[PDB]
Amino acid sequence: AISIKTPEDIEKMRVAGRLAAEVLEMIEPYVKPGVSTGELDRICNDYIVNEQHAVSACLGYHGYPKSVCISINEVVCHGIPDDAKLLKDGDIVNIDVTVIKDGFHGDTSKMFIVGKPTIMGERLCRITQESLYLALRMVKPGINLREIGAAIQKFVEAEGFSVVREYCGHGIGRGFHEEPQVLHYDSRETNVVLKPGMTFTIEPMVNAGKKEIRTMKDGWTVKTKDRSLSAQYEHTIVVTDNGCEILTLRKDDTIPAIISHD
Ligand SMILES: O=C(O)c1ccc(-c2ccccc2OC(F)(F)F)o1
Ligand SMILES: [Mn+2]
Ligand SMILES: [Mn+2]
Ligand code: NA
């Protein structure tokens, strides 16, 4: 079954979601040429622990060594912050945050373009975010997740890009990853009709080249097989009576927090 959050639970999710979003708003100025992904991670963790009085759900999860995931260019996901990896002009970087506050999880990520942006990097990030937005605009009770996954894939592939199959969105609450699975492509296996109160994430991973990926030897880093650029954006949401509410909205988001279909 899919857990239907209570008004009280949803309010706790709003708090956790806001905190996650605020980590991304906070780190923005630090994402520039020369900075290491390792330092970015420490800055995020100190902020979460000392200022938000929360905890990173990533640190130690399934054995993950850091507080946030930072993936650059061809890295698809789960990039491990390293003191020796420095951002450079033109890089596109995803910082993925997940905070636990008062028992509930807030999960979100965004792409940052470092230094002078390249038109393709800028295009891939924009299209990826738009694929997330178009999906969010479809969320409402009665619709099947298969439809949303189908729409994301259709849009992304129409741009000459591909959708990563190995990873998906997920239900979220007191647990980091809960049912249901939220695929970002069409699958004959998906059959989940949305209901008010459900809280989950949408987080498409899009490759500029082919969909195939490769896992490095550190047991976490995932890259595109052809080494093409890959981008991702993620938001945690709650299904309302007539649509949804984005719990991890940021000041830079170009979409409203509350999406009504009334
Ligand atoms: O956004 C997510 O759901 C996400 C990001 C990273 C992960 C993850 C999933 C399984 C094992 C480790 C993972 O990385 C981390 F521990 F950092 F959460 O899940
Ligand atoms: Mn995430
Ligand atoms: Mn997630
Ligand atoms: Na990438």
Swiss-Prot record:
Presence of keyword Acetylation: no
Binding site residues for substrate: 78, 98, 177
GO terms of molecular function: ferrous iron binding; initiator methionyl aminopeptidase activity; metalloaminopeptidase activity
EC number annotated for this UniProt entry: 3.4.11.18
Gene Ontology BP, a term: proteolysis
Variant or mutagenesis effect after changing residue 78 to A: Reduces activity 100000-fold for the Co(2+)-complexed enzyme, but only 2.6-fold for the Mn(2+)-complexed enzyme
Keywords, ordered alphabetically: Aminopeptidase, Hydrolase, Metal-binding, Protease
Pfam families: Peptidase_M24
GO cellular component: cytosol
Binding residues annotated for a divalent metal cation 1, in chain numbering: 96, 107, 234
Binding site for a divalent metal cation 2: 107, 170, 203, 234
Broad EC category: hydrolase
Catalytic reaction list: Release of N-terminal amino acids, preferentially methionine, from peptides and arylamides
Cofactor(s) this protein requires: Co(2+); Zn(2+); Mn(2+); Fe(2+)
Membrane spanning residue stretches: none
Note describing how the cofactor binds: Binds 2 divalent metal cations per subunit. Has a high-affinity and a low affinity metal-binding site. The true nature of the physiological cofactor is under debate. The enzyme is active with cobalt, zinc, manganese or divalent iron ions. Most likely, methionine aminopeptidases function as mononuclear Fe(2+)-metalloproteases under physiological conditions, and the catalytically relevant metal-binding site has been assigned to the histidine-containing high-affinity site. Binds 1 sodium ion per subunit. The sodium ion has a structural role.
Subunit structure: Monomer.
Function of the molecule: Removes the N-terminal methionine from nascent proteins. The N-terminal methionine is often cleaved when the second residue in the primary sequence is small and uncharged (Met-Ala-, Cys, Gly, Pro, Ser, Thr, or Val). Requires deformylation of the N(alpha)-formylated initiator methionine before it can be hydrolyzed.
Descriptive protein name: Methionine aminopeptidase
GN (gene name): map
